[PDB]
Design a protein around this ligand. Structure first.
Ligand code: UYL
Lengths: 300, 237
């Protein structure tokens, strides 16, 4: 179980850790989060009480270093940093725990939600998408645009997911125009899976990362990414049986976790109705269709 | 974006453009079978691709053999249309290729866009105009070449005959759409108007009769009367 200490909390803020969250008051004696499960990526995120604009946060894996949070009064945000002095860090953490100034990652033992949302998400892959090689953790916020949004503006601060474009030469083989547009199996299996991602685990990892950035930061380009990656699978007539079964599990847990009150802005009516009721895979996502029909029957 | 009454004169500027109409591509007769079920028999069709500035009509004849063994023909017909338009564009010298293609039905947008990905600078546009090009097969010489075709074939026409010698392309397009609208609303009556005077003939190299300027004014009035008529006969007014 690892720890992310905070130097202090000088400004009132709501702090998220994965799917959990808690309020910290201005100058409250808060010094971090303990008992963080090893083996998963994690996200620690922030919304200031005085400007709910710009949610922002950091993806990290405690196996990759000792990380802490410190407020920067010049740039006006809580920054993640790495402590290289391992003895300094252990000393700091132990004192804060002894004084009980830390919240405990509040995982119920029965609960596999975070595993289910991050099963295929790897820190190594997140760092290719979010380019800042000098840090081992990755900053994301509500306003960062994707490479695709930039094509349609700062490149250093962009989300480099693969751009999914169904009306593109990559997606459409010369001479198979109708075939490839109506059945996207070529684009999914040959271009994306064999060509770019290398395997379906990697594809699902980007899919899962995109959803989580959409949900935790309201990042619009990430929401577009998530839906495009779903639609590419549902619009392919030839998809390995194990991919379809895993996709149904992935989406089930995403739909289950989504805040009921954000369904209007995080779910695309067209994509979901197409995927569940018109697409080649309309009958292959039993768990997802059942939770969608019972939780969001309005959208459909 | 979409072409409508507000940006109408754009059709007659000096940017090459083509209208594409796919209505008459997939044509069928419906009939009863010996068992008393219903079946369709395809007949030859055509793509109607028109330059509204010059009157050049690229009439690609769609022979019934292209449907053999194929499923979902109404969907296929849109993609076949897009395929043949793309082939036409590729066959033209660069300086004759269109800068825009306007499709008369919105269901042609995605098929044509996908077939034209190689031509990112050619704009594919819909229109809010209700153009009467489905009536092209009421022009006898066009219907004749379509029905006589025994194989795929492209035939070139000028749908304005020699009108541009005397009138502008705006006025020629207006005459064309009035004639086609009439033929679509009451083909028999429209054809009666156009031919009732045997002294006015259709040149071998023309589609419509050799009316004088004054005779076109009369003809055009008779076509408006017909259209307003049928509009009453229809709605009782
Ligand atoms: O431009 C990119 C694409 C990629 C990282 N940068 C490659 C791995 C798969 N998607 C993210």
């Amino acid at each position: 179980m690892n720890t992310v200490p905070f130097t202090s909390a000088p400004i009132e803020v709501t702090i998220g850790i994965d799917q959990y969250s808690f309020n910290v008051k201005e100058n409250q004696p808060f010094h971090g989060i303990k008992d963080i499960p090893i083996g998963h990526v994690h996200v620690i995120h922030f919304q200031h009480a005085d400007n709910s604009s710009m949610r922002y946060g950091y993806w990290f894996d405690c196996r990759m270093g000792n990380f802490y949070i410190q407020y920067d009064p010049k740039d006006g945000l809580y920054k993640m940093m790495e402590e290289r002095d391992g003895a300094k860090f252990e000393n700091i953490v132990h004192n804060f725990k002894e004084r009980q100034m830390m919240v405990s990652y509040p995982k119920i033992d029965e609960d596999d939600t975070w595993y289910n949302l991050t099963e295929f998400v790897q820190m190594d892959k997140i760092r290719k998408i979010v380019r800042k090689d000098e840090n081992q953790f990755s900053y994301v916020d509500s306003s960062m645009t994707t490479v695709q949004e930039n094509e349609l503006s700062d490149p250093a601060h962009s989300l480099n997911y693969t751009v999914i474009n169904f009306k593109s030469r990559e997606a459409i083989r010369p001479g198979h125009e109708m075939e490839d547009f109506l059945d996207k199996s070529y684009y999914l299996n040959t271009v994306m899976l064999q060509g770019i991602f290398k395997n379906s685990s990697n594809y699902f990892g980007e899919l899962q990362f995109a959803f989580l950035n959409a949900m935790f930061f309201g990042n619009y380009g990430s929401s577009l990414q998530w839906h495009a990656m779903i639609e590419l699978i549902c619009s392919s007539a030839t998809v390995p049986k194990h991919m379809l079964d895993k996709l149904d599990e992935i989406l089930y847990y995403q739909i289950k976790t989504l805040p009921e009150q954000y369904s209007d802005i995080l779910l695309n009516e067209r994509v979901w109705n197409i995927c569940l009721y018109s697409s080649f895979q309309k009958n292959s996502l039993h768990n997802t269709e059942k939770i969608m029909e019972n939780k969001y029957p309005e959208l459909l | 974006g979409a072409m409508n009454s507000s940006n109408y004169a754009e059709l007659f500027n000096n940017d090459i453009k083509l209208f594409v109409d796919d209505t008459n591509v997939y044509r069928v007769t419906v009939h009863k079978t010996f068992e008393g079920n219903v079946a369709t028999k395809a007949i030859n069709g055509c793509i109607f691709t028109l330059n509204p500035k010059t009157g050049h009509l690229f009439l690609k004849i769609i022979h019934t053999s292209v449907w053999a063994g194929q499923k979902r023909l109404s969907q296929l017909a849109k993609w076949k249309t897009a395929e043949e338009v793309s082939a036409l564009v590729r066959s033209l010298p660069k300086e004759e290729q269109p800068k825009q293609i306007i499709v008369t039905r919105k269901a042609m947008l995605d098929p044509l866009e996908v077939h034209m990905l190689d031509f990112p600078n050619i704009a594919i546009r819909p229109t809010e105009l209700r153009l009467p090009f489905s009536a092209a097969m009421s022009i006898d010489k066009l219907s004749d070449v379509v029905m006589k075709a025994t194989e795929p074939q492209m035939v070139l026409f000028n749908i304005y005959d020699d009108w541009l010698d005397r009138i502008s392309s705006y006025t020629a397009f207006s005459r064309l759409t009035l004639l086609l609208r009439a033929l679509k609303t009451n083909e028999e009556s429209a054809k009666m108007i156009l031919l009732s005077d045997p002294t006015i003939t259709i040149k071998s190299y023309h589609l419509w009769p050799s009316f004088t300027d004054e005779q076109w004014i009369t003809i055009e009035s008779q076509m408006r009367d017909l259209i307003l008529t049928e509009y009453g006969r229809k709605y009782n007014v």
